[PDB]
C-alpha cells in the first residue's frame, strides 16, 4: 500500500460529488511527488495532500484515517519518511484558498485531544467534530465538508 492508493482513495468522494475533475488524483500525486506534505505528530504521522488548480470546482477537505501507518515523505527535508496514519486531502481554487485551510489545520494538529479523538472514533463522530470546528471558524466559510468525506481506509 503506497501513498498513491491513499490519495486516489480520499479523492474518490470528491470526484463523486463533483467538487474536482476525474484526474484530480493524478494531480495531488504529481504535487505530492514535488512538495511532500508528511508531518510528525504525537503518535501518528499526518499528511496534507492538496492540488490547487483550475480543475478544482469547489474547495473541500477529505479526511482519511488509516489503520496501519503509511509512509508519506517528509514535508521538511529529512532522510526518513513519516509513518502517516491521518490524512487531510485538500482541494482548492487558489493558493490563498489553500493557505487559509492550511493554517487552520496546524491548530488542529496542535490540539492533541482533537487529534486523539480522530484515531479512536467513528466516521460520524469525526464528521461532527470537524464540522463543528469548521463552523467556529468564519475564515473557513465556503469550504465543503460532508459526512461522506470521512473514511477509515485500511492498509
Amino acid at each position, epitope marked *: 500500500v503506497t501513498q498513491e492508493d491513499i490519495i486516489r482513495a480520499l479523492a474518490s468522494p470528491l470526484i463523486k460529488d463533483g467538487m474536482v475533475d476525474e484526474d484530480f488524483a493524478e*494531480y495531488v500525486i504529481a504535487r505530492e511527488d514535488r512538495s511532500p506534505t508528511g508531518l510528525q505528530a504525537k503518535g501518528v504521522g499526518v499528511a496534507i495532500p492538496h492540488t490547487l488548480g483550475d480543475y478544482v470546482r469547489d474547495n473541500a477537505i477529505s479526511v482519511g484515517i488509516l489503520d496501519k501507518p503509511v509512509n508519506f515523505e517528509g514535508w521538511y527535508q529529512s532522510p526518513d519518511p513519516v509513518p502517516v496514519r491521518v490524512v487531510f486531502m485538500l482541494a482548492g481554487r487558489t493558493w490563498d484558498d489553500i493557505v487559509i485551510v*492550511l493554517k487552520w489545520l496546524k491548530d488542529v494538529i496542535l490540539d492533541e485531544e482533537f487529534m486523539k479523538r480522530l484515531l479512536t472514533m467513528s466516521d460520524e463522530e469525526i464528521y461532527r467534530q470537524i464540522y463543528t470546528r469548521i463552523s467556529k471558524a468564519p475564515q473557513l466559510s465556503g469550504i465543503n465538508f460532508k459526512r461522506e468525506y470521512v473514511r477509515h481506509l485500511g492498509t
Partner: antibody
Amino acid sequence: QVQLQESGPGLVKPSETLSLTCAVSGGSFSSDWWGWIRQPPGKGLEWIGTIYGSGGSNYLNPSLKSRVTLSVDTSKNQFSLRLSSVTAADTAVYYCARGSGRYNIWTGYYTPFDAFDFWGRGLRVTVSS
Amino acid sequence: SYELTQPPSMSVSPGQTARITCGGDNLGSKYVHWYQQKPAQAPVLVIYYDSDRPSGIPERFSGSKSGNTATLTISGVEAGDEADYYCQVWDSSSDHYIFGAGTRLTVG
C-alpha cells in the same frame, strides 16, 4: 533538469501587444510556479509576474499589473505572457523561470515562490516601427 | 518603492575571497537570493534563502546575513567567476520581487 525554451515575435510595432510562450520539458509543470523576468539592454532584472502551473493563481508586478496577463496550458507544458500597449521601454530580453519556494507550517511562511531556480534561454524583443 | 542597494562593482585579484554585499530594509527578516549572470547568458542562482546553496553550485560560493544586510562569499576566486551578481528579496509590503542593481566583476 528543467528545460525552458521561450518563443515569440521578437519585433513588435509600438503601441501593439507582445505575445510570448514558454515550453517546459522539465516534467513537473503542474506543480511548479512559472514566471517571466526581463532585462532591458545594459540594465538589471525586472520580474513581470508568475502563474501557477495548474492554472488558478497569478502574481503580477504591481506597476505592470495593468499591462500584463498570464496563461497556462498544462497539457502542453506551456505558459504564456501578454504585454499590452508596448513601448520602446519594453524593448528587452525576456526570460521564463521556474519558482523556488520553502513553505513552513508552524511558522506561517507560505510565499509560493521565493527565488527563480531554473531559467530559460532568453528571447530578444525589439519595439520598432 | 522598495529597492536593494549593492555596490556597483568589485575587483579582486585571483586567489582571494569575495564578499559581495546587498542592503535593504529588514533584510534580516527577508530571504535573500543571489544570482550570477555572465555575458550573453541567463542568470544562475548561486545562493538561495540566505545561506543555502543550489545543487551543482561549488561550495566556494556561499552566502550569509548580517542585520539588515546580506552578503555573498565567493571563496577560491577564479577567473571564470567573473560576472554580474544580483540579490533578490520578496518584501511582503508591495508584493513585488526586487532584484538587486548588480555588482560587476572580472577582478587585475
